[PDB]
Write a protein that binds this ligand. Structure first.
Ligand code: BE9
Ligand code: ZN
Length: 255
C-alpha cells in the first residue's frame, strides 16, 4: 500500500475491508455541528521525561520513535480514562501548501498534520492495545505555513540522512513539547488509524490551534523519498488520507 493512483486510499479496502468501516479516520470537523462538552476533563500532556530514540523513513512518512517501556511521556485527561504512553510521532503533508492535512476544519485543508501516537497502558503493550476499542489516543496538530517552528528544526535538520525508505538515524534527546501550539483547546471523536491496517482503536484529540512552520521547513519534508536507495525517485508528498464518512459519530469540543 501507498499513496499513488495504483496503491492509494481508494484501493486499501481490498486488503483492509475495515477501510469502509463505521469509525474510520480522518474526518471533516464541521465546527457548526461539533458541540462543547462540559464533561470533558482538562487535557494533560506530560512529556517532561520523554525519551526519543530514532527517526525512520518507512516509505510512507518519517517516524520519530520513543522509549515506551515505562510511563515517561504520557497523555491523560481530556476524554481519556487512564494513561496513554507516547510511542511515536509522524507527519502527513502535501505537494503544495493548500493540502496535506488529514483532518479538515469546515473543509479547510492545512499544509500538514502532526500525529503523536499513544497506547493505553492498561493493555500492557502496543500490540495488545490495538485489539481494543480504547487502545490508542492520537494527538493531531495542524501545520500552516508562516514563521518557523524552532522546535521542529532538529527534525528538519536530520531528514537529509534518512532520504529513502528503510533509512534510520539516532534521534535521542528530542523534546516533543516544542511541537505544540500555545492552546490545548481540542476536538475529540472515536476513530481509527489513517494508514493500513486502519484499526478502529483510536480516541482522536485534534488541537484547534495550528502550529506555524516555515516554507523552508515544509520544503525539506517534500525532499524525502517514498522509494528505497538507488531506486527511481518518487518524492514523499501527499501522504495523506482524505476525509471519511462520519457515520453515527459525534465530535465534541473542549472549548
Ligand atoms: N496516521 S497513522 O495511522 O497513525 N499512521 C501510522 O500508523 C501508525 C501505526 C502504528 C504506530 C504509529 C502509527 N503510521 C505512519 C505512516 O506509516 C505507517 C505508520
Ligand atoms: Zn498519521
Amino acid at each position: 500500500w501507498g499513496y499513488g493512483k495504483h496503491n492509494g486510499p481508494e484501493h486499501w479496502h481490498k486488503d483492509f475491508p475495515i477501510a469502509k468501516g463505521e469509525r474510520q479516520s480522518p474526518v471533516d470537523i464541521d465546527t457548526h455541528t461539533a458541540k462543547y462538552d462540559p464533561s470533558l476533563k482538562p487535557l494533560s500532556v506530560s512529556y517532561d521525561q520523554a525519551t526519543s530514540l530514532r527517526i525512520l523513513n518507512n516509505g510512507h512518512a518519517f517516524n520519530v520513535e520513543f522509549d515506551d517501556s515505562q510511563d515517561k511521556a504520557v497523555l491523560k485527561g481530556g476524554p481519556l480514562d487512564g494513561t496513554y504512553r507516547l510511542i511515536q510521532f509522524h507527519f502527513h503533508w502535501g505537494s503544495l501548501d493548500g493540502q496535506g492535512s488529514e483532518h479538515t476544519v469546515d473543509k479547510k485543508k492545512y499544509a500538514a498534520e502532526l500525529h503523536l501516537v499513544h497506547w493505553n497502558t492498561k493493555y500492557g503493550d502496543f500490540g495488545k492495545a490495538v485489539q481494543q476499542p480504547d487502545g490508542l489516543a492520537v494527538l493531531g496538530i495542524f501545520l500552516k505555513v508562516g514563521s518557523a517552528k524552532p522546535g521542529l528544526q532538529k527534525v528538519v535538520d536530520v531528514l537529509d540522512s534518512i532520504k529513502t525508505k528503510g533509512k534510520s538515524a539516532d534521534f535521542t534527546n528530542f523534546d516533543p513539547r516544542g511541537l505544540l501550539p500555545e492552546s490545548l483547546d481540542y476536538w475529540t471523536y472515536p476513530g481509527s488509524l489513517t494508514t493500513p491496517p486502519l484499526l478502529e482503536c483510536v480516541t482522536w484529540i485534534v488541537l484547534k490551534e495550528p502550529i506555524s512552520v516555515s516554507s523552508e521547513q515544509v520544503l525539506k519534508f517534500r525532499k524525502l523519498n517514498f522509494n528505497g536507495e538507488g531506486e527511481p525517485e518518487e518524492l514523499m508528498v501527499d501522504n495523506w488520507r482524505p476525509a471519511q464518512p462520519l457515520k453515527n459519530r459525534q465530535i465534541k469540543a473542549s472549548f
